[PDB]
Amino acid sequence: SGFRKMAFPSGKVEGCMVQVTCGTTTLNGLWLDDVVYCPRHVICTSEDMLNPNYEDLLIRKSNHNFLVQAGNVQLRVIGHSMQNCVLKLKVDTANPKTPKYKFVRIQPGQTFSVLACYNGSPSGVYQCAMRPNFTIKGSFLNGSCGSVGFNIDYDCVSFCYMHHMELPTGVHAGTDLEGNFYGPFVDRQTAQAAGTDTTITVNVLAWLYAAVINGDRWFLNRFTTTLNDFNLVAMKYNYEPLTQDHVDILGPLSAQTGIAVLDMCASLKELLQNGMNGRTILGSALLEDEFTPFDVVRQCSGVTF
Amino acid sequence: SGFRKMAFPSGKVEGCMVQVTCGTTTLNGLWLDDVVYCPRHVICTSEDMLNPNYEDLLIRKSNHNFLVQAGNVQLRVIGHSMQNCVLKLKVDTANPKTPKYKFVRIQPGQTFSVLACYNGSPSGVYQCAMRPNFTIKGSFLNGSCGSVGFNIDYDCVSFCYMHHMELPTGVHAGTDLEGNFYGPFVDRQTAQAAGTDTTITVNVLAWLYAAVINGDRWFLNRFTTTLNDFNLVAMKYNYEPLTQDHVDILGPLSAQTGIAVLDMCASLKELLQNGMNGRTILGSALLEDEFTPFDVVRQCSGVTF
Ligand SMILES: *[C@@](O)(c1nc2ccccc2s1)[C@H](C[C@@H]1CCNC1=O)NC(=O)[C@H](CC(C)C)NC(=O)c1cc2c(OC)cccc2[nH]1
Numbered sequence: 001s002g003f004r005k006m007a008f009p010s011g012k013v014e015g016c017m018v019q020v021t022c023g024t025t026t027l028n029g030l031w032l033d034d035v036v037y038c039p040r041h042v043i044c045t046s047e048d049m050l051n052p053n054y055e056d057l058l059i060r061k062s063n064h065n066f067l068v069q070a071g072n073v074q075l076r077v078i079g080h081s082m083q084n085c086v087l088k089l090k091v092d093t094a095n096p097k098t099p100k101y102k103f104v105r106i107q108p109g110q111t112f113s114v115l116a117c118y119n120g121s122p123s124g125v126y127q128c129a130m131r132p133n134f135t136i137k138g139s140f141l142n143g144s145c146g147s148v149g150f151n152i153d154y155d156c157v158s159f160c161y162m163h164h165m166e167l168p169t170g171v172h173a174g175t176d177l178e179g180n181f182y183g184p185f186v187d188r189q190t191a192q193a194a195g196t197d198t199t200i201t202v203n204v205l206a207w208l209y210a211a212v213i214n215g216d217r218w219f220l221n222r223f224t225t226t227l228n229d230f231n232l233v234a235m236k237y238n239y240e241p242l243t244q245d246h247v248d249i250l251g252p253l254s255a256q257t258g259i260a261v262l263d264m265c266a267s268l269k270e271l272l273q274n275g276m277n278g279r280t281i282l283g284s285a286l287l288e289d290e291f292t293p294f295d296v297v298r299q300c301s302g303v304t305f
Numbered sequence: 306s307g308f309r310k311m312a313f314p315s316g317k318v319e320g321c322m323v324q325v326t327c328g329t330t331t332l333n334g335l336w337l338d339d340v341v342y343c344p345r346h347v348i349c350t351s352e353d354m355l356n357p358n359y360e361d362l363l364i365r366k367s368n369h370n371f372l373v374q375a376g377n378v379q380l381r382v383i384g385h386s387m388q389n390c391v392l393k394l395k396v397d398t399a400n401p402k403t404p405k406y407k408f409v410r411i412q413p414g415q416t417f418s419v420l421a422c423y424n425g426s427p428s429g430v431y432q433c434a435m436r437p438n439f440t441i442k443g444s445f446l447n448g449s450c451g452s453v454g455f456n457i458d459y460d461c462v463s464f465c466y467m468h469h470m471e472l473p474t475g476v477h478a479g480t481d482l483e484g485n486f487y488g489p490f491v492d493r494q495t496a497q498a499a500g501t502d503t504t505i506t507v508n509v510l511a512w513l514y515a516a517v518i519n520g521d522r523w524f525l526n527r528f529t530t531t532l533n534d535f536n537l538v539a540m541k542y543n544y545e546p547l548t549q550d551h552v553d554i555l556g557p558l559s560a561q562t563g564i565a566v567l568d569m570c571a572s573l574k575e576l577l578q579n580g581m582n583g584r585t586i587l588g589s590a591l592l593e594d595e596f597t598p599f600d601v602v603r604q605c606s607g608v609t610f
C-alpha cells in the first residue's frame with residue numbers, strides 16, 4: 001500500500017555525469033561510450049548571450065579549450081561537433097560505466113526522473129512531467145544545466161531531457177539528447193514565455209485509479225458519461241481532451257478495479273464541479289496530473305529494473 | 306527556482322542490495338563489506354508467524370539454509386547471527402561496491418530516502434519522513450521487506466531504516482539497521498496500531514521559508530506571536546510543540562529571508578485558523594511537513610554529494 005512520487009533508481013545515470021568547462025563557464029555533461037553531451041552554450045561568454053552565433057563561436061574553439069572532468073580525472077577532448085543545441089565532445093576514454101541506453105523524445109504528458117547535478121556531481125533525484133506547454137516544473141539552480149531526465153526499462157536507460165533554461169515564471173525548459181528543444185524555446189539569454197498550460201486529463205484519471213487500488217473510493221459515483229459530454233467539461237476547467245487512445249491506455253487499470261473509464265470520467269466531472277469538500281485523495285487536496293497510467297501500474301504492481 | 310520532494314541519488318545503495326532466501330521466503334538484504342543485513346523473519350514459515358520464537362528458530366538453521374544472491378552471483382554464507390530484529394549473514398565475499406557508510410537511528414521528524422526493492426532489485430526511490438508516531442507513509446508491496454532508507458552526507462551513506470511491516474492503516478513500520486523498531490511495533494504477523502500522529506511543526510515552517518525563498522509571499526502578515534501563544538494554537542490543530550531548539554535550527558532560513566521565526570509562526574497561525582482560501586503554496590493545497598530545515602537549505606542552495 002501507499003502511493004508516492006517515485007523516481008527511478010539513479011545509479012546508472014550517476015556514473016555518466018561529468019563536468020565540462022569552457023573558459024569561465026562550467027556545466028554538466030553526460031558521458032556515454034567515448035562521447036560527452038552537454039548544452040552548446042557552454043561556449044558562450046558573458047556578453048554575447050543575447051543572440052550568439054554558435055557556428056561562428058564553435059569554429060573559433062579548439063579541443064584544448066574544453067576541460068572535461070569525471071570525478072577528478074580529466075578526460076582529453078579529441079573532437080567536437082554541434083548537433084542542434086547540444087555539443088558532442090569526443091574524448092579519448094570510453095566510459096566503463098556506460099549503461100545500456102537510448103535517446104528518446106517524449107510526448108507531453110509523459111513523466112521522467114531528473115538527476116539534478118552541479119559541477120558534475122549529483123545532488124538529488126525527483127520525478128517530473130513534460131507539461132502540455134513543453135515546460136517542466138523542476139527544481140534547478142545556477143549550474144544545473146546539462147542535468148538529464150530519464151526513464152529506465154529493464155536494463156535500459158532512455159534519456160529524454162537535458163536541462164537548459166529557467167523561464168521568467170520559474171518553470172524550466174530544455175532539449176532532447178539530440179539537442180532539439182521541447183516547445184518553442186531557443187538557447188539565448190532572453191525572457192521567453194511558455195504557452196498557457198493545461199491539466200493532463202489521462203494522468204488525473206490514472207491517479208484516481210491508483211487511489212481506488214489503494215482503498216480510496218469516496219469520490220466514486222453511480223454515474224457514467226459520454227466521452228463527448230466529459231470533454232465539454234474538461235475544456236471548461238482547462239483540462240486536455242481525452243481521446244479514445246487515452247481510454248484504451250487506461251484499459252488495464254479499469255479492468256483491475258472494475259470501474260469503466262467513462263464511469264471514472266463521471267467521478268472526475270463531479271470533482272471538477274464540486275471540489276473535494278475538505279477531503280483528500282492519496283494525501284493531496286488537489287487533483288494530481290504527474291502520474292501516467294504506466295507509472296500507476298509500475299508502482300501498484302512493483303515492477304523492478 | 307522550484308521546489309520538489311527530492312531524494313538522494315541512490316547509486317551507492319543500489320550496489321548493496323541483494324536477495325536473501327530461507328526456504329520459501331525471499332526478501333531483500335543489504336550487503337556491506339562481508340556482511341548481509343536483512344529482517345530476521347526471513348527465517349519464519351507460514352504457520353508460526355503469529356508469535357515465533359526467533360532464538361529457537363535460528364538455532365535450528367545452518368549457513369546452507371540461507372541463499373544470498375547479488376545480481377545472479379550466489380554468495381556463500383559462512384556465519385549467521387541475530388541482532389534485535391535483524392539477521393546478519395557473514396558471506397565469503399566483501400562487497401567491492403561498499404560505500405563509506407554509517408548506521409544511524411533517527412528522531413521523529415527527520416526525513417530520508419527509501420530505495421524500494423523487490424527480489425534484490427531496486428524499483429524506485431522516494432523521500433519519506435519518520436512520523437511523530439514512528440510510522441512512515443511509504444509505498445511498499447509484498448516482497449519489499451529489507452528495503453532501506455538512507456541519507457547521504459558528502460561521500461557517506463547514513464542508513465537509518467530497514468523495512469519490515471505494513472500496519473492495518475496502510476502506513477509502514479520498520480527498524481534501524483541494528484534491528485530496533487521505531488515505535489512500539491514487534492515483528493510478528495499481527496495487526497498493530499500506531500499512536501495518533503501529529504504534524505511536524507518545524508518542518509511546516511521550513512517549507513513556508515522555502516516558499517518565500519522561491520517567491521511565494523501571499524501568506525505572510527504583519528504580525529508576530531510568542532512561542533507560548535503559538536503553541537496553544539499548534540495544540541488545537543494537532544501540531545507538535547515548537548521548541549527553542551526548533552527556533553534556533555530555523556535561524557539560517559530566517560536570516561536568509563529576513564523573516565523572524567516568530568513572525569513566520571504568526572503566518573502559520575493565520576493559515577491554520579483561516580485556511581488557504583483556494584490558494585496554493587509551492588503547488589500544494591495542504592501544509593507540507595516532510596521537508597526539514599536542512600532539506601530546504603540543501604535544495605534552495607544546491608548542495609551536492
Ligand atoms: C544553466 O545552468 C546554464 N548556465 C550557463 C551559464 C553560462 C553559459 C551557459 C549556461 S547554461 C542555467 C540554468 C538556470 C539557471 C537558474 N535556474 C536554471 O534552471 N541556464 C541559463 O542560465 C540559461 C542560459 C541560456 C543561454 C540558455 N538562461 C536562462 O535560463 C534565462 C535567461 C533569462 C533572461 O535573460 C534576460 C530573462 C528571463 C529569464 C531567463 N532565463
Ligand SMILES: *[C@@](O)(c1nc2ccccc2s1)[C@H](C[C@@H]1CCNC1=O)NC(=O)[C@H](CC(C)C)NC(=O)c1cc2c(OC)cccc2[nH]1
Nearest residue numbers: 346445446447448449450469470471473492493494495496
Ligand atoms: C515484507 O515484505 C515481508 N514479507 C515476509 C513474508 C514471509 C516472511 C517474512 C516476511 S517480511 C512484508 C512487507 C508488507 C507487505 C505489504 N505491504 C508491506 O509493507 N512484511 C510483512 O508481511 C510483515 C511480516 C511480519 C512477520 C513482520 N507483516 C505485516 O506487515 C502485517 C501483518 C498484518 C496482520 O497479520 C494478521 C494484520 C494486519 C496488518 C498486518 N501487517
